[PDB]
Amino acid sequence: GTTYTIFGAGPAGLYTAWRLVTGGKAVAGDTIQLYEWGDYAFDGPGSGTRLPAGRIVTHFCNDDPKQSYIEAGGMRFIEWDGTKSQGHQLVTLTIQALGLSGKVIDFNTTDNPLLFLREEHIYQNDLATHPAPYNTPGNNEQPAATLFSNISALITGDAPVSTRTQQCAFYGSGRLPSTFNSFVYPPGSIAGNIGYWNVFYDQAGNEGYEYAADAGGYTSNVINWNAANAAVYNGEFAPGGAFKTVNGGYSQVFVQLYQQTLAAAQEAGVAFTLTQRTRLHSVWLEDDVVNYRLASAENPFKGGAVQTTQNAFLAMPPASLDLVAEATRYADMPEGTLDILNAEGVQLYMDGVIRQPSMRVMLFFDRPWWTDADVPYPPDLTSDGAPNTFGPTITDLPLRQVYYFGNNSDGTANPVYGVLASYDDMQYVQFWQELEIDVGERRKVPIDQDYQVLFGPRKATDTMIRMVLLELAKVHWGDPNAAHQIPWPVEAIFNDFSLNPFGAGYHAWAAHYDICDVMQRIRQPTGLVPGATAANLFIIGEAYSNDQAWVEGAFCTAESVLVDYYGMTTIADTTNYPLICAC
Amino acid sequence: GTTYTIFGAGPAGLYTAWRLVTGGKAVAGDTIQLYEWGDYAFDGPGSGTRLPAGRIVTHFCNDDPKQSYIEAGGMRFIEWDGTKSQGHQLVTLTIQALGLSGKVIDFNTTDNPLLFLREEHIYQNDLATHPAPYNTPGNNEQPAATLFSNISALITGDAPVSTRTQQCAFYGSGRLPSTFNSFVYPPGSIAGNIGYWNVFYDQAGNEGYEYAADAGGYTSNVINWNAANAAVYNGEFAPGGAFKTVNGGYSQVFVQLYQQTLAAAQEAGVAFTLTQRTRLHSVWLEDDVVNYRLASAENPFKGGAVQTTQNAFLAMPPASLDLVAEATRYADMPEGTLDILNAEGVQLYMDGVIRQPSMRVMLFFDRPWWTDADVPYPPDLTSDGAPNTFGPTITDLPLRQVYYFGNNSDGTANPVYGVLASYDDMQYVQFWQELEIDVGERRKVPIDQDYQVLFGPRKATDTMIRMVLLELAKVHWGDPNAAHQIPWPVEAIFNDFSLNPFGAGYHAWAAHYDICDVMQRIRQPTGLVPGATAANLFIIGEAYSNDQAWVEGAFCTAESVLVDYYGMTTIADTTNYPLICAC
Ligand SMILES: Cc1cc2nc3c(=O)[nH]c(=O)nc-3n(C[C@H](O)[C@H](O)[C@H](O)COP(=O)(O)OP(=O)(O)OC[C@H]3O[C@@H](n4cnc5c(N)ncnc54)[C@H](O)[C@@H]3O)c2cc1C
Ligand SMILES: Cc1cc2nc3c(=O)[nH]c(=O)nc-3n(C[C@H](O)[C@H](O)[C@H](O)COP(=O)(O)OP(=O)(O)OC[C@H]3O[C@@H](n4cnc5c(N)ncnc54)[C@H](O)[C@@H]3O)c2cc1C
Ligand SMILES: NC(=[NH2+])NCCC[C@H](N)C(=O)O
Ligand SMILES: NC(=[NH2+])NCCC[C@H](N)C(=O)O
C-alpha cells in the first residue's frame, strides 16, 4: 500500500490527513503518519499541554472547558457566501462536514471604535468634529478606511479588482495607472515590485501612513508587503463577508479533524497515527525518494535513523522550514542526493513572504470593569437596535488593539470576563519580549530555543500584567494612575508568536515577487530545481497561500496539492474561487 | 613554534594580530593566520572589493581616492583625554602608534539641529517659540536631551554613575530609587532586569517616548535594551569627550594595522598570513584542541578537511557566530568532542545583547544644494559664535537623521559634496529593504545570503534615490514636489547592516542579564560549560564589550583577552579605565 507522511499537525497537516481519508485517496492497507513537534490535547483534558493546533489555540480560563475562553491564536472566520463567491469556503465546508455548523455564531465588531491616538480619545463616528491629531489634511476627519480605499484606488486605477480571480491577476499584471502622480514611482510601474508602506508613504506622507497604521481596522495590513496584493486586499473591493466564530472555540475544529480522521480511518482500514513530541529534523531527496530524520522534543537538534517515504508534506511555516533546512545546509550529504530545501530556487521562493511578529495577552477578570458607569471612555460594545460587540478599541500604543470577549461561556461556570490585548509589528517585538521574564530574574532560556507557543499560553509576569493595566487605564480613563481602579486579573497568559518554531504571527507576500508563480511552484519544490526528478515532497500552510491571514489559506494550499499532485476531486466549488492563484 | 588563528579580519581581529606581533607575544618561529570571509583592499587599488574592515568602510566617490568620501560604516571616535580619563583610549593610542595622529580632525555637530516632526519644521533653538507637536507637556518645549537626562535621573537616583567603574557597578547592582513612582515597577527593582523603552514609556508615556525617539541626537538610543546600562549611557553623565574623525577615512586605520603588522612580523621572524575569501565554517573542541573547517566564499556552506589549532579567536559579531554554530547544531559530532558554540551557557550568554538594524545611504552631489539661498529650511552648519559642523538634521521619518559632509576631497579638480542618510531600527528594516531591488525586477538573491556589506556599498536603485530626495525635499522645503529641485546625485550607494553576516548595525546589552558576568565570561566560552576542558578559544569584538557603539569596544575586548589569557602587558592606562567591567 501507500504511505502518506505529514510533518506538522497544525491546520494544514490535519486537514490533509482528513481529506486523504474522507476523500478516499488513502484506501484499506494505506498508512498516514502525522508527526508533531508539540504535545497538543487531541484526546480531551489531560491528553496534551494545550488544545490543538499550531497557531490556533483556544484558551479556557483555569483550563476549565466550561469556562469563558479567549482565542490565544486565530479567533474568527468569514462564512462562505456562494451567491457572492466570497468568504472562507474550505473552512465553512469543513465546519459543516465535521458536524459543527450548529456552533457557528456571529463575531460582531463595533461600528464606532474608540481610537486612542496621541493622548486624544476619539470615537470613530466623531472624527468629522474631533479630527485625529495627525497632520494629514482631509484624511484626519474620516475613518482610516477612507484613506485605505483612496490609496488602493490610486494603485489599481481602472483595473478590475473585485473578484478573487481579478485580484490574483492584478498581483502579476497590475500596474500603477497612467495618472499615477509621484516623484518616486513612475506611471505603469509593476505594482508587485513596490512595497505597500513605501508607496502609501509616497502618496499620503508620513502623517497619512501613521494615521492609517494607528487608526486602521484589524484586517487592513500596512506592513511593507507586496503593493499589488495590499492594494486589492485593503481597497474598496477587498474580499469581505460576515465574521463568525465557533462557539466553544476554534480549537475544536482541529480536535474534530483528528478524531473524525481516526474514526473514518478505522472504518476504511487506513492506518492513521499521530506521533507527538516528535519533529522532522532533516529532509532530502534521492531522486523521487524522500529521506528524513526525526528528533524528539527533548533533544530536538539530534536526528535518529534515516527513514524514507514516497509522500511527504511539510505542513509548517517559513521559520519551521528554516530550522529543518539548517540541519542539512552545512552538512556533507550522501552522493546522488538533493538537499531540496537549500536549493537556490527553493530558498529564493521561501523569501517570497515577509514576517510580522505578534504577541497576544489574554486576561480574565471577575467583572466587566470596562462597562462601569464612571469609565470616562468605555468601549462602544452595544448600540440599541444592534447586537452586542467585542470592540475593538484601536490605539497608537504598543498595545495596539483590545477586544472584550467578556463572559463567552454557556454561563454554567463562575462568570469571568475576557480581554484580548494585541501587540504586533517589528517596531514592538523588542518592547514586549522583556516583559516575558520576571523583573526579579535573569533570562534562562536562549530566545531562539524558547518554544513558548508550542507548549501553551505562558503565565503573564507581574510586569506584563501591570503594563497591560497601565495601557488600558490610559485608553479607558486617560490617566495612567487609573490602573489602580482596574481589578487584578484572575488569570493572565500570553502567546509570543515571534518565537520559534512559528517565527511570526503572520506572513505577507513580498514586493519583487510574482506571487502566483511562488504560490504555484513552491508547493512541489523539486519544480524549482532545474533537472531534478519530481518528488511528492510538498510545502503547505497559510504562508504561501492566497489567504495568509486565515486558516482558509492553510486548507487551500493543502487542497491544491491534493488536487494537482494526487488527482483528488476538490470539495470546493472553484468556478469563482481559485484555491490559489493561477498565472 | 606557537600558532595563533584569528577568524575575522575586522577591527577586533586586526587589532589582535597587531598587538600579538608589536607587543612581542608572537616571537621568531611563531605563526599568525588570519581568515576573512570578505575580500578587503589591504594592499591598495586592485587588492579587494572595498576598503577594510568589517563594519568600518570609507567610501570614496567614483572609487577615486582624491575625491570626497563618506563613511559608509563607523565614522567618528572620542579622543582620549588622559587628564579627565575620558574617551576612546585604545583607538586614540592605536591611531598614534600607527602614525595617523596627523590626520585627526574635529567632527563637530550643530547645537541648533533642524527638526522635522509631524510635518512641522522647528530649529531646536526655537522650541520655546514652536513647541514640538507631541502631547508631552513641558518636555515638548525643551530639547529631547532634557527628557533623556530626566528619565536617566529617575532610574539612577542617588547612585554615582559618572565613572566607568561606577557605571559597570550600576549594571549589576543598580536599583530603582525608593522614590520611583510607577504602577509597573516597584521601588528597588533591579534596573538590569528592566527594558529601557518599557520604563521610558512607563515614566514619560507614549508621546514622551516618541518625542525622545524622533528628536533625540545622533548618539541617543531608545531601543528596549538593558535599562541600567541605558540610564547611565543616555544620562546627563553619559560617557563624553571631544568627537574626532580620521581625515581620508577611518578605513586607513585598518589598512595600516594590516600593513604595519606584516612589516613588524617580517622583522620579528613571525609568519603572518591573511587568507581572504575564506570563512570559518564550523568549530568545536577536543579537550584543549580547537577543531575547525573552512569554507570558500564561493561555497560558504561546505567545509573542507578538519584543521586544528591551540589558539583561536572568533573576532566576529553575534550573527556571524550564529552562522558558525548552525553548522554543528544539528550534526552528529565526533566522539569526545565539545560543540562549544551550541553549549547551553554559551547560547544563553550570546543572547545577552539585542540587535539594532541600520542602513546608510551615501549620496554625492555636484554642488552643496542645501546651502542655496532659496532653501526654506537649510541645515544650521554655521553659527555666529561656533565653528562649522556636519549637522545633523533630525526627523520622525524613516530617514531619521541627515549628516552633510560636503567637500572633504584631497586634490580632485571636480569635488563632490556628500550627504549621509541614516535609516535605523526594527520599525523600518522592512521599509528600506524593498528599495534595494530595482522596481523593474524581482528579487534574485535569498535575503539571508545577500552578503552586501561584506562585498561593499551597493549602487542605490533609482527608487531608493528618489525616496531619499523626496524625504530631503520634505525636510528642506516642506514640499514633496521640491524633490525636482535637488540635483540628481553624482553617485549614490548604500550599506544595509541588517544583512548577513553582520545582522545588525549595533548591539546593545539586553535586559535580564548580568552584563559584567557576560562581558567577563563569554570571552572564553569553555568557562560557561561545566566539566569542559579549558581551551584558548575566544570571542572578541564590540558586541560583548563596554563600548558597543564603537571600534573602542572591539579593541577593548581583544586587549582584555591578550592581558587575561596571554599575560600581555596592556598599552592602556587602566587606572580610571577598565577595559571591560569587573565583577
Ligand atoms: C495572532 C493570530 C491571530 C490569528 N487569527 C486568525 C483568525 O481569527 N482566523 C483564522 O482563520 N486564522 C487566524 N490566524 C491564522 C492561523 O493561526 C493560521 O493560518 C494557521 O494556524 C496556519 O496553519 P498551518 O497549519 O499553516 O500552520 P501552523 O498553525 O503554524 O502549524 C504548523 C505546525 O507545524 C508544527 N511543526 C513545526 N516544525 C515542525 C517540525 N520540524 N516537525 C513537526 N512539526 C513541526 C508546529 O508545531 C505546528 O503544529 C491567526 C494567527 C495568529 C498568529
Ligand atoms: C552604521 C554604523 C555606524 C558606526 N559608527 C561608528 C563610529 O562612528 N565610530 C566607531 O568607532 N564605531 C562605529 N561603528 C561600530 C564599528 O563599526 C564596530 O564597533 C566595529 O566594526 C566592530 O569591529 P569587530 O571586529 O568587532 O566586528 P566587524 O566589524 O563586524 O568585523 C567582523 C569581521 O568578521 C568577519 N567574519 C564574519 N563571519 C566570519 C567567518 N565565519 N569567518 C571569517 N570571517 C568572518 C566579517 O566579514 C568581518 O570582516 C558603527 C557601526 C555601524 C554599523
Ligand atoms: N484579510 C485580511 N487581511 N485580514 C487581516 C487579519 C485578520 C486576523 N486573521 C484576525 O484575527 O481576525
Ligand atoms: N544605537 C545607536 N544609537 N548608535 C549610535 C551610537 C553612536 C555612533 N557609533 C556614532 O557614530 O557616534
Contact predicate A318/A504, CB 8 Å: yes
CA atoms within 13 A on the CB side of B366: 6
- Pick the residue whose CA is nearest to atom 5 on ligand 3: A219
b/e map A54-88, b = 16+ CB within 10 Å = bbbbbbbbebebebbbbbbbbbbbbbbeeeebbbb
Of the candidates B62, B86, B206, B34, the one whose C-alpha atom is nearest the C-alpha of residue B134 is B206
Angle ∠(B318,B323,B328) on CA atoms, nearest 5:
120
Gyration radius of chain B's alpha carbons:
24
DSSP string, B161-186: -SSHHHHHHHHHH-B--TT---SSS-
Pocket test of ligand 4: the residue of B79, B218, B423 to mutate, having most ligand atoms within 8 Å of its CB, is B218
From residue B488, give the alpha-carbon distance in Å to each of B213, B435, B561. Answer: 30, 17, 49
- Pick the residue whose CA is nearest to atom 12 on ligand 3: A76
Give the domain B3-49+250-354+509-566 fold.
FAD/NAD(P)-binding domain (3.50.50)
For CA atoms A258, A263, A268, A273, the dihedral sign is: positive
Contact predicate B26/B267, CB 8 Å: no
Contact predicate A35/A294, CB 8 Å: yes
Q: For ligand 4, what atom is nearest to the CA of residue B508? A: 1
Looking at the complex, report in whole angstroms how far the Cα of residue A299 sits from the nearest Cα belonging to chain B.
10
Residue showing cell 478524531: A259
Residues on chain A touching B359 (C-beta within 8 angstroms): none
Q: What is the resolution of this structure in A?
A: 1.6
Residue B40 alpha carbon to ligand 2 centre in Å: 13
Q: Give me the residues paired with residue A100 across strands.
A: none
CB contact under 8 A, B480 and A439: no
Of the candidates B551, B546, B514, the one whose C-alpha atom is nearest the C-alpha of residue B352 is B514
Residue B73 alpha carbon to ligand 2 centre in Å: 8
Residue A392 alpha carbon to ligand 3 centre in Å: 13
Q: What distance in Å separates the CA atoms of residue B315 and residue B10, rounded to the nearest whole number?
A: 7
Tell me whether residue A299 is exposed, middle or buried, using C-beta atoms within 10 angstroms of its C-beta: 0 to 12, 13 to 18, 19 or more.
Answer: exposed
Give A50's DSSP letter.
B
Is the bond into B392 cis (omega within 30 degrees of 0)?
yes
The CATH number corresponding to A3-48+250-316+347-354+506-566 among 3.30.1390.20, 3.40.50.10490, 2.30.40.10, 3.50.50.60 equals: 3.50.50.60
Of the candidates B333, B353, B311, the one whose C-alpha atom is nearest the C-alpha of residue B545 is B353
Question: Ligand 2 within 6 A of B505 CB?
Answer: yes
Residue A218 alpha carbon to ligand 3 centre in Å: 6
Amino acid, single-letter form, for residue B183: F
Q: What distance in Å separates the CA atoms of residue A419 and residue A475, rounded to the nearest whole number?
A: 14
Q: For ligand 4, what atom is nearest to the CA of residue B506? A: 1
> B175 CB contacts (<8 Å, ≥6 apart)?
B188, B189, B190, B191
Residue B513 alpha carbon to ligand 4 centre in Å: 22
Q: What distance in Å separates the CA atoms of residue B151 and residue B131, rounded to the nearest whole number?
A: 20
Tell me whether residue B348 is exposed, middle or buried, using C-beta atoms within 10 angstroms of its C-beta: 0 to 12, 13 to 18, 19 or more.
Answer: buried
Q: What distance in Å separates the CA atoms of residue A484 and residue A47, rounded to the nearest whole number?
A: 39
Residues on chain B touching A329 (C-beta within 8 angstroms): 301, 326-327
b/e map A362-372, b = 16+ CB within 10 Å = bbbbeebbbee
Of the candidates B89, B71, B37, the one whose C-alpha atom is nearest the C-alpha of residue B553 is B89
Residue B74 alpha carbon to ligand 4 centre in Å: 8
Looking at the complex, report in whole angstroms how far the Cα of residue A322 sits from the nearest Cα belonging to chain B.
11
CB contact under 8 A, A348 and B439: no
Question: Ligand 3 within 6 A of A164 CB?
Answer: no
Q: What distance in Å separates the CA atoms of residue A147 and residue A212, rounded to the nearest whole number?
A: 7
- Ligand at minimal distance from the CA of B283 is 2
Q: What residue ranges do the domains of chain A occupy?
A: 3-48+250-316+347-354+506-566, 132-234
Tell me whether residue A255 is exposed, middle or buried, using C-beta atoms within 10 angstroms of its C-beta: 0 to 12, 13 to 18, 19 or more.
Answer: buried
Is the bond into A392 cis (omega within 30 degrees of 0)?
yes
CB contact under 8 A, A205 and B474: yes
CB contact under 8 A, A330 and B197: no
Residues on chain A touching B329 (C-beta within 8 angstroms): 301, 326-327
Q: What distance in Å separates the CA atoms of residue A353 and residue B503, rounded to the nearest whole number?
A: 19
CB contact under 8 A, A511 and B193: no
CB contact under 8 A, B348 and A446: yes
- Ligand at minimal distance from the CA of B494 is 2
- Pick the residue whose CA is nearest to atom 35 on ligand 1: A8
Q: What distance in Å separates the CA atoms of residue A275 and residue B498, rounded to the nearest whole number?
A: 39
CB contact under 8 A, B350 and A446: yes
Question: Which DSSP helix (H) or strand (E) runs through B261?
Answer: helix B251-268
Percentage helix, strand, coil for chain B under 3-state DSSP, each rounded to 5: 35, 20, 45
Looking at the complex, report in whole angstroms how far the Cα of residue A127 sits from the nearest Cα belonging to chain B.
19
CB contact under 8 A, A512 and B434: yes
Residues on chain A touching B500 (C-beta within 8 angstroms): none
Q: What distance in Å separates the CA atoms of residue B443 and residue A577, rounded to the nearest whole number?
A: 29
Three cell numbers written together for A57:
489555540
For CA atoms A512, A518, A522, A526, the dihedral sign is: negative
Residue A339 alpha carbon to ligand 2 centre in Å: 32
Q: What distance in Å separates the CA atoms of residue A380 and residue A391, rounded to the nearest whole number?
A: 7
Three cell numbers written together for A2:
501507500
Contact predicate B439/B463, CB 8 Å: yes
Q: What distance in Å separates the CA atoms of residue A422 and residue A506, rounded to the nearest whole number?
A: 13
- Pick the residue whose CA is nearest to atom 2 on ligand 3: A219
CB contact under 8 A, A431 and B197: yes
Query: Domain B358-496 is in which class?
Result: alpha beta
Please name the member of A118, A470, A512 whose beta carbon is closest to the beta carbon of B135: A118
